[PDB]
Design a protein around this ligand. Sequence first.
Ligand SMILES: Nc1nc2c(ncn2[C@@H]2O[C@H](COP(=O)(O)OP(=O)(O)OP(=O)(O)O)[C@@H](O)[C@H]2O)c(=O)[nH]1
Ligand SMILES: Nc1nc2c(ncn2[C@@H]2O[C@H](COP(=O)(O)OP(=O)(O)OP(=O)(O)O)[C@@H](O)[C@H]2O)c(=O)[nH]1
Ligand SMILES: Nc1nc2c(ncn2[C@@H]2O[C@H](COP(=O)(O)OP(=O)(O)OP(=O)(O)O)[C@@H](O)[C@H]2O)c(=O)[nH]1
Ligand SMILES: Nc1ncnc2c1ncn2[C@@H]1O[C@H](COP(=O)(O)OP(=O)(O)OP(=O)(O)O)[C@@H](O)[C@H]1O
Ligand SMILES: Nc1ncnc2c1ncn2[C@@H]1O[C@H](COP(=O)(O)OP(=O)(O)OP(=O)(O)O)[C@@H](O)[C@H]1O
Ligand SMILES: Nc1ncnc2c1ncn2[C@@H]1O[C@H](COP(=O)(O)OP(=O)(O)OP(=O)(O)O)[C@@H](O)[C@H]1O
Ligand SMILES: Nc1ccn([C@@H]2O[C@H](COP(=O)(O)OP(=O)(O)OP(=O)(O)O)[C@@H](O)[C@H]2O)c(=O)n1
Ligand SMILES: Nc1ccn([C@@H]2O[C@H](COP(=O)(O)OP(=O)(O)OP(=O)(O)O)[C@@H](O)[C@H]2O)c(=O)n1
Ligand SMILES: Nc1ccn([C@@H]2O[C@H](COP(=O)(O)OP(=O)(O)OP(=O)(O)O)[C@@H](O)[C@H]2O)c(=O)n1
Ligand SMILES: Nc1ccn([C@@H]2O[C@H](COP(=O)(O)OP(=O)(O)OP(=O)(O)O)[C@@H](O)[C@H]2O)c(=O)n1
Ligand SMILES: [Cl-]
Ligand SMILES: [Cl-]
Ligand SMILES: [Cl-]
Ligand SMILES: [Mg+2]
Ligand SMILES: [Mg+2]
Ligand SMILES: [Mg+2]
Ligand SMILES: [Mg+2]
Lengths: 62, 247, 247, 247
Amino acid sequence: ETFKALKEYREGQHNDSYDEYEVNQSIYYPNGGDARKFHSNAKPRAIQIIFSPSVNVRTIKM
Amino acid sequence: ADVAGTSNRDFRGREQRLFNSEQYNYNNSLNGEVSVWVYAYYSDGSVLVINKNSQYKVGISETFKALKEYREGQHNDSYDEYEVNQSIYYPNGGDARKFHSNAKPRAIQIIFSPSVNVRTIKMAKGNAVSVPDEYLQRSHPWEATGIKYRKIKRDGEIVGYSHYFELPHEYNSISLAVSGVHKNPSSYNVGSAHNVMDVFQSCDLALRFCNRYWAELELVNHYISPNAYPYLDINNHSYGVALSNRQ
Amino acid sequence: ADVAGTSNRDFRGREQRLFNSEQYNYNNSLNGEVSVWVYAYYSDGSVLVINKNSQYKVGISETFKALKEYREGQHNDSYDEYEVNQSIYYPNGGDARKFHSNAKPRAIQIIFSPSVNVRTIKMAKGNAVSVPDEYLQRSHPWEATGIKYRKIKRDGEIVGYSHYFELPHEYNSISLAVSGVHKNPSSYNVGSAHNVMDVFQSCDLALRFCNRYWAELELVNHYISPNAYPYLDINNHSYGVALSNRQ
Amino acid sequence: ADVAGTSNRDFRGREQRLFNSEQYNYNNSLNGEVSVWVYAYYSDGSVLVINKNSQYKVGISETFKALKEYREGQHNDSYDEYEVNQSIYYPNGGDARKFHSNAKPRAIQIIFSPSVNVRTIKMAKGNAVSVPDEYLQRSHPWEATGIKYRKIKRDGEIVGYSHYFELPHEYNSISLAVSGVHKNPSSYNVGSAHNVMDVFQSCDLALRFCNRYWAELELVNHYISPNAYPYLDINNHSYGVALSNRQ
Ligand SMILES: Nc1nc2c(ncn2[C@@H]2O[C@H](COP(=O)(O)OP(=O)(O)OP(=O)(O)O)[C@@H](O)[C@H]2O)c(=O)[nH]1
Ligand SMILES: Nc1nc2c(ncn2[C@@H]2O[C@H](COP(=O)(O)OP(=O)(O)OP(=O)(O)O)[C@@H](O)[C@H]2O)c(=O)[nH]1
Ligand SMILES: Nc1nc2c(ncn2[C@@H]2O[C@H](COP(=O)(O)OP(=O)(O)OP(=O)(O)O)[C@@H](O)[C@H]2O)c(=O)[nH]1
Ligand SMILES: Nc1ncnc2c1ncn2[C@@H]1O[C@H](COP(=O)(O)OP(=O)(O)OP(=O)(O)O)[C@@H](O)[C@H]1O
Ligand SMILES: Nc1ncnc2c1ncn2[C@@H]1O[C@H](COP(=O)(O)OP(=O)(O)OP(=O)(O)O)[C@@H](O)[C@H]1O
Ligand SMILES: Nc1ncnc2c1ncn2[C@@H]1O[C@H](COP(=O)(O)OP(=O)(O)OP(=O)(O)O)[C@@H](O)[C@H]1O
Ligand SMILES: Nc1ccn([C@@H]2O[C@H](COP(=O)(O)OP(=O)(O)OP(=O)(O)O)[C@@H](O)[C@H]2O)c(=O)n1
Ligand SMILES: Nc1ccn([C@@H]2O[C@H](COP(=O)(O)OP(=O)(O)OP(=O)(O)O)[C@@H](O)[C@H]2O)c(=O)n1
Ligand SMILES: Nc1ccn([C@@H]2O[C@H](COP(=O)(O)OP(=O)(O)OP(=O)(O)O)[C@@H](O)[C@H]2O)c(=O)n1
Ligand SMILES: Nc1ccn([C@@H]2O[C@H](COP(=O)(O)OP(=O)(O)OP(=O)(O)O)[C@@H](O)[C@H]2O)c(=O)n1
Ligand SMILES: [Cl-]
Ligand SMILES: [Cl-]
Ligand SMILES: [Cl-]
Ligand SMILES: [Mg+2]
Ligand SMILES: [Mg+2]
Ligand SMILES: [Mg+2]
Ligand SMILES: [Mg+2]
């Protein structure tokens, strides 16, 4: 997934879509955007990766 | 004339030092202001500041709702946020479409000006329905929290006092009021009969300010620093201007 | 050990009774809260509650406009409601598209906590432009209405005091303020010079709460009952919790 | 110590040169990335970039619709643009209110990193319904276009490879996929049985990036240059960073 694809998207609700384009520009290059917020609450705060028991753990790559 | 910075006849230097010393001491006289600031920090990095400036005594009191982030001229999920409030006032009392409102404060910083007497500070940190301690019947209406205030210092001078507390847990849903009295080392009680109606007028004359700044950088640059206010940032850096006996 | 509920050594029972008695008496000490609630009832069955909790004395003051129903996050006919207000402030002064605004309160209930002294209660029930009695020049700024307050009782104990008045007529357009002082059977005046600056701080520390609940059932279930507040419903049923000398 | 820039003991200089040489050669080892970029140029001067970075082999495949300009958070004539698409998929098949959609790309630039083997590059430039050459039955699924790629050079070093083609005609309505394999001058086949499951994992681990920049200046300043990517602008100016045996 891309940086953008992992950001929170609320289906059928407002998502500050224009400001969030500007947020993305500021994250891709420092000072590259014109957003109206310091930190987007759509950015993930954490990630958990889980595999089923049929994986071989030594093959996992990230 | 004597040469600058070489003798006791540098009257420009003596006047500069008195000008600053007079500002510092005027603020601490009974004719001066006492000020308080409440900073509510939001997860989007914005900060609501509420300031009250008044003679003799000063304070701020806000509801749970009033401390929540409000973005002027932008969408604020206003209907869902009513439902969030209902769920915070009573568990399972609302029908919101979110587990945690990002409008709830993540932290609070209370700052007083150097003219407060720290031993007079009182705080009522209530629950979301504005009760100080679980039930009204057993609630003392405030807690004297002065002992927890840190001195904000610049060049060795106290420029203000800070109490900071984070609200990182889901159950940290508060109402808040805070109060402090202007220093008064004299035995002239400002609230005794001679002057009590002036203290009543001070309740009317207190000036309030409130605004949401987008970042702590913006708060430092355009709110704290231009007005010579004291502040303590997330990196524990102290801001303010030392005035006593200084040029 | 002795068997429960059979002797004078049931310390768990003695401690339960003291725990409740202490809450009741703490509320009535000068260290306790005094609380007031204003309930504004609307024709859609919703109820606005405004609560203020403070030491020493407490009150609420609202304009005609502020008491009108406001549905958060829903349409409120905001332009027509400005025109309604103009027509209420002066007859034929507005251009509204309705004869009677359903946002006007149909009734008001004022409740005080049991720590108030009923003889101190004062109410300023003004007209729509915030004048207590027709013209300012002849207005006394309040009326002492304590005699009209009914005791709200539970298990024989006074849990609160209620004054209720309906506003069913087209001309019942009011502004409203109410005030009460905490009981003080002592001869220590809380506002004498020794303690007057603490009363000034109490003005700053008072906590306010306001919310619109959709029904009296919802108010009873999620506002009154969870917080052990006193209430009187439309069927004259008293709500609250008796604490003095009770388990 | 010896003086800088005067002898064979300038270890800081030798380490700087090795640091750059190691980056250049690591990229070209089988442990390194192979990257491709597709730039779609629009008449409003904006540019969509799609990048894919992966080990062993890499590619991008997009539909006619996916290459059309999409302005995030702005109006995009979305209903008329569905009708435009219907008219492009079959002549006279739609009901659009425009002759030429300004969302169609005016040009395409394909760039590969210097770790690609140019002889492995393949492109499927299909029609608007995703058929490579008029009809499926007679379509070879790609064309090996390596011979047309220009070297992008900086300080005499190849920093990347470019194929550029304009789409200035009304009939230039395409779908597009492109693919290249990482250089492998060895006789260890990365897709032979020993390592083929690592190539399958590389299909999963490939990282994609896509964004629309407002101008070629902005692309150069904030996309190409900060990331040390190769690029060729409309004035035939080459961008990139030479690393082999350089300080
Ligand atoms: N711990 C706790 N406090 C609660 C709860 N519900 C309400 N509170 C209030 O939360 C306040 C304490 O909050 P915190 O100091 O942030 O929580 P903590 O458990 O002490 O944890 P840390 O301070 O983060 O180490 C109390 O004064 C209570 O009034 C609950 O579920 N747990
Ligand atoms: N009766 C009356 N009161 C008015 C009028 N305009 C304003 N008022 C105010 O209305 C208040 C009395 O209202 P109500 O008690 O609800 O009316 P009421 O005539 O006594 O009738 P009921 O109480 O329903 O039996 C007074 O205190 C006035 O300030 C008017 O046209 N008629
Ligand atoms: N010339 C032409 N090509 C068509 C037409 N319809 C579809 N095509 C496609 O267009 C491609 C060629 O496009 P271009 O190279 O841009 O056109 P060109 O006629 O060669 O003209 P220039 O390159 O501008 O000199 C072919 O590969 C076809 O698949 C049509 O009407 N005319
Ligand atoms: N209540 C006060 N108001 C104003 N200035 C004060 C007050 N108390 C002390 N000061 C002065 O402020 C300066 C700093 O003194 P302070 O006691 O805060 O520093 P410290 O002893 O180094 O640190 P700390 O006491 O915080 O551990 C001194 O000039 C002191 O005289
Ligand atoms: N001001 C007060 N505050 C608290 N408790 C009170 C007060 N006045 C009386 N009580 C107590 O409250 C209880 C009820 O007394 P109260 O006089 O209200 O009842 P009553 O005489 O049956 O009814 P009422 O007087 O309303 O006709 C008794 O325990 C009484 O001692
Ligand atoms: N496949 C390749 N990968 C990396 N470097 C290469 C490759 N082929 C040649 N080089 C090197 O790149 C540099 C430029 O050589 P190149 O043949 O591109 O230049 P040229 O002969 O001046 O121009 P051109 O061949 O494009 O007409 C030399 O150092 C050459 O050894
Ligand atoms: N940095 C920003 C953010 C917003 N806006 C303007 O504010 C409008 C509303 O903001 P937007 O980010 O699109 O939010 P919403 O409309 O509330 O939500 P959504 O678009 O996801 O439905 C936009 O159309 C845009 O014109 C802007 O000028 N600059
Ligand atoms: N718990 C919720 C939240 C929202 N909605 C519906 O979704 C609509 C849009 O949501 P709202 O919370 O009001 O957000 P915005 O309109 O996006 O923002 P704002 O109202 O602050 O301008 C509301 O009118 C309401 O009908 C709902 O039914 N239940
Ligand atoms: N007496 C009135 C009432 C309404 N209107 C017009 O009707 C529009 C809609 O009415 P409004 O009272 O504002 O109601 P809503 O938009 O439905 O609700 P709200 O504004 O509270 O969201 C207004 O903008 C105004 O132009 C008017 O001309 N005269
Ligand atoms: N060929 C077309 C183009 C537009 N419309 C009508 O015009 C409206 C507005 O056009 P649209 O193409 O959707 O553009 P915008 O709303 O301006 O932009 P977007 O939808 O991307 O936000 C559409 O809802 C549709 O009803 C139509 O009937 N036939
Ligand atoms: Cl003084
Ligand atoms: Cl007491
Ligand atoms: Cl290798
Ligand atoms: Mg939008
Ligand atoms: Mg809304
Ligand atoms: Mg309106
Ligand atoms: Mg549309």
